[PDB]
Amino acid sequence: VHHDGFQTVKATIDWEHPMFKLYEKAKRNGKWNPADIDFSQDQKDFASLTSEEKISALPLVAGFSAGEEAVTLDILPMAHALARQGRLEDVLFLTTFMHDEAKHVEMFSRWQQAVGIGQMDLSVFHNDHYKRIFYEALPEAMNRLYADDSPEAVIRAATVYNMIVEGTLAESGYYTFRQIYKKAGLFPGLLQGIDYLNMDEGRHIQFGIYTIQRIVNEDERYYELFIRYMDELWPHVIGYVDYLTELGKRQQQLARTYALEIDYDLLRHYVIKQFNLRKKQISRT
Amino acid sequence: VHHDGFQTVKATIDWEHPMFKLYEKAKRNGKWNPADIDFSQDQKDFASLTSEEKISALPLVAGFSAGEEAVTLDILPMAHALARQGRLEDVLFLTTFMHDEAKHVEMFSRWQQAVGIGQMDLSVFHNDHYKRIFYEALPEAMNRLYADDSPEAVIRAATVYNMIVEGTLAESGYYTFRQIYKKAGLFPGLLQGIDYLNMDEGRHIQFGIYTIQRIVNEDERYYELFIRYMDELWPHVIGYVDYLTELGKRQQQLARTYALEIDYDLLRHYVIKQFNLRKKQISRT
Numbered sequence: 001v002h003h004d005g006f007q008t009v010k011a012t013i014d015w016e017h018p019m020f021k022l023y024e025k026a027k028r029n030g031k032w033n034p035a036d037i038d039f040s041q042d043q044k045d046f047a048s049l050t051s052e053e054k055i056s057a058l059p060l061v062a063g064f065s066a067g068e069e070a071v072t073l074d075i076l077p078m079a080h081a082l083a084r085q086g087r088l089e090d091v092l093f094l095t096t097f098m099h100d101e102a103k104h105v106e107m108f109s110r111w112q113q114a115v116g117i118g119q120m121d122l123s124v125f126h127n128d129h130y131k132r133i134f135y136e137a138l139p140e141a142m143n144r145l146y147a148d149d150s151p152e153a154v155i156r157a158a159t160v161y162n163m164i165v166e167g168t169l170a171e172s173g174y175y176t177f178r179q180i181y182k183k184a185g186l187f188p189g190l191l192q193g194i195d196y197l198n199m200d201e202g203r204h205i206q207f208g209i210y211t212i213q214r215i216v217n218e219d220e221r222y223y224e225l226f227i228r229y230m231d232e233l234w235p236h237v238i239g240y241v242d243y244l245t246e247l248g249k250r251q252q253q254l255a256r257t258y259a260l261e262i263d264y265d266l267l268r269h270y271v272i273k274q275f276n277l278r279k280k281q282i283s284r285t
Numbered sequence: 286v287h288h289d290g291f292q293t294v295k296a297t298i299d300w301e302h303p304m305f306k307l308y309e310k311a312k313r314n315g316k317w318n319p320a321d322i323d324f325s326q327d328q329k330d331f332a333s334l335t336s337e338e339k340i341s342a343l344p345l346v347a348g349f350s351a352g353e354e355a356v357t358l359d360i361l362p363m364a365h366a367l368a369r370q371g372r373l374e375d376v377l378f379l380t381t382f383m384h385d386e387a388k389h390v391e392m393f394s395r396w397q398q399a400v401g402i403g404q405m406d407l408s409v410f411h412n413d414h415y416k417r418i419f420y421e422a423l424p425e426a427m428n429r430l431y432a433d434d435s436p437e438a439v440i441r442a443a444t445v446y447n448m449i450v451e452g453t454l455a456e457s458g459y460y461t462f463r464q465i466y467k468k469a470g471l472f473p474g475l476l477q478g479i480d481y482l483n484m485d486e487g488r489h490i491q492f493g494i495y496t497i498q499r500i501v502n503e504d505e506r507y508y509e510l511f512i513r514y515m516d517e518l519w520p521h522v523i524g525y526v527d528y529l530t531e532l533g534k535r536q537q538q539l540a541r542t543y544a545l546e547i548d549y550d551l552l553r554h555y556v557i558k559q560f561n562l563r564k565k566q567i568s569r570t
């Protein structure tokens with residue numbers, strides 16, 4: 001429906017708003033372009049590998065590529081809901097959030113193209129637990145906001161997207177990439193991309209913390225809802241992590257070749273740490 | 286609802302898609318930051334003016350500030366509709382479109398703040414015709430896409446937003462700013478912003494041409510709909526232009542002071558030219 005008026009005609013941007021400040025930082029720190037990354041060495045690395053070694057890296061890339069695409073599509077309802085609420089500074093920031101995720105989709109798709117696996121269907125490495133999070137729960141929670149923008153709905157959406165998908169899974173994925181391939185000296189272009197992604201992710205997670213905390217600040221009983229929604233998704237998080245771990249343990253040729261002692265118990269504890277850490281960044285009071 | 290799968294897992298980005306190419310150009314040409322513009326001379330210019338001269342520049346700024354804010358909010362339904370249709374490259378491009386409009390909102394709001402009119406309510410310079418376009422028709426046409434993404438609905442939305450608001454009014458506004466203030470040597474910061482806006486606008490209009498043409502290409506009877514929707518809005522376009530012209534003719538102190546022979550008949554013909562020119566960029570066949 002209609003606009004009743006416009007904030008930048010009646011007044012100005014709220015220059016001191018936390019999300020205006022986050023928007024300003026995003027513009028300053030968000031200049032990187034996936035089209036500038038040199039993937040030539042990645043191509044050679046991947047070709048050098050045996051078929052067994054080649055397969056090793058793909059489950060993780062499969063999880064990220066679909067994840068970036070899901071979040072690019074599924075952030076749009078949040079931008080709409082906050083826009084309808086007149087939260088202009090949040091919307092300005094969210095334009096940087098969405099543009100970041102677009103570059104993340106682009107970065108992984110360029111890597112796949114470059115190393116010669118674009119024609120390969122990597123959906124085979126999404127198990128039921130992954131599908132429950134990314135094919136179902138994420139888009140359910142975000143799309144709800146089109147018809148229900150209650151504090152309850154907004155907390156559930158920020159929890160699944162910013163605190164679980166980004167703050168638990170994506171963060172653990174970046175850590176895993178560096179623990180495995182940065183050590184091996186493999187895929188320098190991909191690891192350059194991962195570093196830029198991990199920098200962007202910082203702002204995405206901070207938006208989710210801001211959003212969940214400002215709702216909790218109104219009524220501390222929303223804190224219990226946050227914790228509950230975090231716990232509801234945990235079985236699928238660890239169920240996916242456990243599935244990737246088993247794939248990893250079954251095809252170890254890459255680790256042998258490159259002298260990597262991949263401690264899967266250390267990666268598993270990192271996921272658990274991330275999850276608990278995100279819980280602690282929200283204050284009940 | 287759920288994702289059935291993901292294009293960048295099954296395959297890759299369509300690298301040859303026109304909107305992927307437009308997205309790539311947006312990243313290359315879209316680096317400018319309103320926070321870097323030096324408005325110090327603008328502040329001094331505005332303070333130097335008499336109250337009568339001060340008032341001269343504000344109707345145009347009022348029209349732009351509200352316009353940028355409306356389009357920042359009202360592009361979100363188009364991104365959603367194309368996302369739901371699986372048009373991934375269009376969505377990637379649209380993240381740059383939305384982020385551009387956010388910077389446009391920011392740029393005018395920084396100028397208002399800097400010259401000392403942020404506290405002034407400029408809604409007084411929106412007449413009924415302006416309100417019909419920006420407070421009503423624009424958001425009606427875009428929001429429709431949430432429940433009706435038929436070719437008819439998508440053509441009406443691209444027509445009002447890209448071909449009328451951007452391709453006719455915004456373009457004519459940029460031309461007007463340069464005809465008046467660039468001549469006077471006034472407001473260098475604002476005119477630097479206008480140049481960056483006008484560069485961005487090129488891509489926005491090209492998205493609308495692409496969108497309307499790909500629908501017309503399917504069925505040439507959609508051409509008649511395009512023309513009809515262009516004509517429906519014309520009375521409000523010229524009605525706003527005529528209102529600004531009369532304000533201009535009533536307070537001429539700025540033009541006298543700075544030796545500007547502001548040909549309002551030339552600006553009016555420029556609007557008419559723009560409108561007819563946009564019609565001609567769509568081919569029936």
Ligand SMILES: CCCCCCCCCCCCCCCC(=O)O
Nearest residue numbers: 063064067068169170172173244267
């Ligand atoms: C065995 C170690 C487990 C590591 C967990 C790997 C997680 C891979 C899936 C990542 C999903 C990516 C979500 C992207 C979110 C975003 O782009 O903001």
Ligand SMILES: CCCCCCCCCCCCCCCC(=O)O
Nearest residue numbers: 348349352353454455457458529552
């Ligand atoms: C007297 C000369 C008439 C000139 C017409 C001035 C138009 C001013 C209003 C501009 C609306 C701005 C719309 C912004 C669109 C966008 O930012 O993409």
Ligand SMILES: [Fe+3]
Nearest residue numbers: 068101104197
């Ligand atoms: Fe991402």
Ligand SMILES: [Fe+3]
Nearest residue numbers: 101166201204
């Ligand atoms: Fe993210």
Ligand SMILES: [Fe+3]
Nearest residue numbers: 353386389482
């Ligand atoms: Fe604009």
Ligand SMILES: [Fe+3]
Nearest residue numbers: 386451486489
């Ligand atoms: Fe525009």
